[PDB]
Design a protein around this ligand. Structure first.
Ligand SMILES: Cc1cc2nc3c(=O)[nH]c(=O)nc-3n(C[C@H](O)[C@H](O)[C@H](O)COP(=O)(O)OP(=O)(O)OC[C@H]3O[C@@H](n4cnc5c(N)ncnc54)[C@H](O)[C@@H]3O)c2cc1C
Ligand SMILES: Cc1cc2nc3c(=O)[nH]c(=O)nc-3n(C[C@H](O)[C@H](O)[C@H](O)COP(=O)(O)OP(=O)(O)OC[C@H]3O[C@@H](n4cnc5c(N)ncnc54)[C@H](O)[C@@H]3O)c2cc1C
Ligand SMILES: [Br-]
Ligand SMILES: [Br-]
Ligand SMILES: [Br-]
Ligand SMILES: [Br-]
Lengths: 393, 393
């Protein structure tokens, strides 16, 4: 059998960041990933990092490229009802910012650091199964070139995202699920074009939501809301750019640099929370435990807060012999998760066009934007949520 | 024919306050009321006045009794999820308060002042009809002891509440209606008992909403949410008090002084806005134009802001010959109306038990309370809304 201290299922950002923090702390860990390295690196996903995530990447020793290439944002724009309003995040949050740096780059940075350090990752780990979670000697089985291997461990971190095995390794009756599926998705287009703005632009347009985001001075990420029936094959680059422009202020659409896509995909929008987030020696983190609609840019940032919490409780278990504190993992994480889920639901509700909206709902949506963007107190609630609420001790 | 400057339909608080402000300004006005004086005075309704309304009553010359008998509140309590949280309105609003003084007392105070001044009110004015609204010589017809009379005027103020004739005197195609009907009502009980708290208590309880309010040191007003099917005849005083106690913190229920009811009634909850709020020489004010669910305590307070605006535009029309400014009435009023409607909808949404709520909605409701009551910025948004946003110039 292989033997480690912490088995990690998934080499996405949750599992890589947990693994790097544990490795540097001298806690033995093994990542098992079903896909190949290139497959994982193909996923586009996050653009917007909270300071908590930036700081955890620095703590993991992986922040050199982010420090050169990351973009610090002090504000964000909401466009609605023919108005353009800047939220001064840095003023209204009491001096906090967010950092733009692609999830593909964070993942690459972690993968290069894990390889450099000589820590253990098994890619193409097929048919992962989890065993004996309520014992002192849990273990993982998997297949590698069709040979069945066993990994003995003390603890398992389920970092295997929404359709991982880890959440399905807990008896359903021990969990409560809280879910909302939104009646639209985001059509996303990544292009090697200069961004149309130095800051993000969220647009609530009568034709539907649009977002102007970015990865660098030379790479942009745009989205438009589409119905759930839509197929990415029916959206040429040309059709995408024409619809995006239709949804933006004419002075923004006029200056937009267009170009052929590097990636196009439709992402469903979902809110999902499980409670609790652990079972015996198994702890769930990131998308294995919870999903947010991307309007709030919180999923990778909540994976970061889960991993930080699990990392600090594991430090207590191994360095101080205080393994009983791991009982608190779910309660700590879920306080932060629910407030980020609330903010993500609010952003989704106020910025999108919903089918079968009545006249009162339309006016309430517009009034929500008018009040929140016209009040110092309202603007402060958006800013503190956008930069992220503090990590709990 | 009778002849006046401003015909006022309705001797509720909107029409009485407008009439008293105009009378004192030397603008001739006549109130036509379908009901008798005692009928109007029988309605219990509002407890909570914004400073804007307190100040308009002082401006109308009617504030002596309110000044002796009104109670100034600096805070309010929200009870939810076994927690009790005080909102410090005075701190968080930058020093504003609200005043508790019953609508029956405001109405009585205005009626006594109008009688003392010898201004014109016709009670039991039957079959009010409005004529020639797009001319220079609009008029009103009505019946008094079965005789049909005519009142000539320059302008008509429709202050005749939700089922008045005035909103039905405008062609439907000239109006847009924004409505929401909530799937519950408030069972209210007024009693000559000392209030259980010096401040209001809003309770979100698993059995449903409850509110502890007051009229004086010796008179209290309590509410519980009931389904729309409920009949006031099935709710004895005893049944009311038992359910109210079931919905309150045990330390509050233990100290509650109960007693026989002075009034019990079930009020439906509705959000309603018409746009615009005028047609030719006809201006709608208060419940004739808009309704809010009482969770926000805004209906009488928005009648006050409509009347203030109409009064100031009428001063410009008569004193300065600037009648064209009356064109702005609806736009001014509707900015304030929509933000109060938004806050009333929010309070209603976060404090009540809704039928057929799913698990995500229940957790989002609880998280909304946790976030808003645990953030300085969140608490500031509740406080500034509860005291009322500023009246527009
Ligand atoms: C359009 C979009 C935009 C977003 N923007 C942002 C943003 O700006 N900010 C933000 O904070 N978040 C954002 N997110 C959210 C963020 O990308 C996710 O929350 C993040 O990918 C979660 O990381 P994770 O490591 O928990 O899960 P994943 O990234 O899903 O990684 C899980 C890994 O587990 C592996 N795995 C699965 N099952 C098994 C198995 N049985 N055995 C072994 N391995 C397995 C998978 O192959 C995968 O590599 C966005 C997402 C989308 C789709
Ligand atoms: C349970 C409850 C609690 C509330 N609490 C508060 C609170 O704390 N704070 C707050 O701000 N508001 C509160 N309100 C709202 C407030 O009571 C109303 O907004 C207020 O009554 C509106 O005054 P109004 O003069 O516009 O209309 P009304 O009070 O309805 O007066 C209209 C008048 O017009 C007359 N009329 C009707 N039709 C005709 C006709 N055809 N011809 C002639 N006369 C006619 C009626 O008989 C009536 O006297 C509450 C209401 C309820 C039900
Ligand atoms: Br990316
Ligand atoms: Br997200
Ligand atoms: Br009253
Ligand atoms: Br009200």
């Amino acid at each position: 059998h292989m033997k480690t201290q912490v088995a990690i299922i998934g080499a996405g950002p949750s599992g890589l960041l947990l693994g790097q923090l544990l490795h540097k702390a001298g806690i033995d860990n093994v990542i098992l990933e079903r896909q190949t390295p290139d497959y994982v690196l193909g996923r586009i996903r996050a653009g917007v990092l909270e300071q908590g995530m930036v700081d955890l990447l620095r703590e993991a020793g992986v922040d050199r490229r982010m420090a050169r290439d990351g973009l610090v944002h002090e504000g964000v724009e909401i466009a609605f009802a023919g108005q353009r309003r800047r939220i001064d995040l840095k003023r209204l949050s009491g001096g906090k910012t967010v950092t733009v740096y692609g999830q593909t780059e964070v993942t690459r940075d972690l993968m290069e650091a894990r390889e450099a350090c000589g820590a253990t990752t098994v890619y193409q780990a097929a048919e992962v199964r989890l065993h004996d979670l309520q014992g002192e000697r849990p273990y993982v089985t998997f297949e590698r070139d069709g040979e069945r291997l066993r990994l003995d461990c003390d603890y398992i971190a389920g970092c295997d995202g929404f359709h991982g095995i880890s959440r399905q390794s807990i008896p359903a009756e021990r969990l409560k699920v809280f879910e909302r599926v939104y009646p639209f998705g985001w059509l996303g287009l990544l292009a090697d074009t200069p961004p149309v703005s130095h800051e993000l632009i969220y647009a609530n347009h009568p034709r539907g939501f649009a977002l102007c985001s970015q990865r660098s001075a030379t790479r942009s990420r745009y989205y438009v809301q589409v119905p759930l029936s839509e197929k990415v094959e029916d959206w040429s680059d040309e059709r995408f750019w024409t619809e995006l422009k239709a949804r933006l202020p004419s002075e923004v659409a006029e200056k937009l640099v267009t170009g052929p896509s590097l990636e196009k995909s439709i992402a469903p929008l979902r809110s999902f929370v499980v409670e609790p987030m652990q079972h015996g020696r198994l702890f769930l983190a990131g998308d294995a435990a919870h999903i947010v609609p991307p309007t709030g840019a919180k999923g990778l940032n909540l994976a970061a807060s889960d991993v930080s919490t699990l990392y600090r409780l594991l430090l207590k278990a191994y360095r101080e012999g205080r393994g009983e504190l791991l009982e608190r993992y779910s309660a700590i994480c879920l306080r932060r998760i629910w407030k980020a889920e609330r903010f993500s639901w609010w952003m989704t509700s106020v910025l999108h066009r919903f089918p079968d909206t009545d006249a009162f709902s339309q006016r309430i949506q517009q009034t929500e934007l008018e009040y929140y963007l016209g009040s110092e107190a309202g603007l402060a609630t958006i800013a503190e949520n956008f930069v992220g609420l503090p990590y709990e001790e």
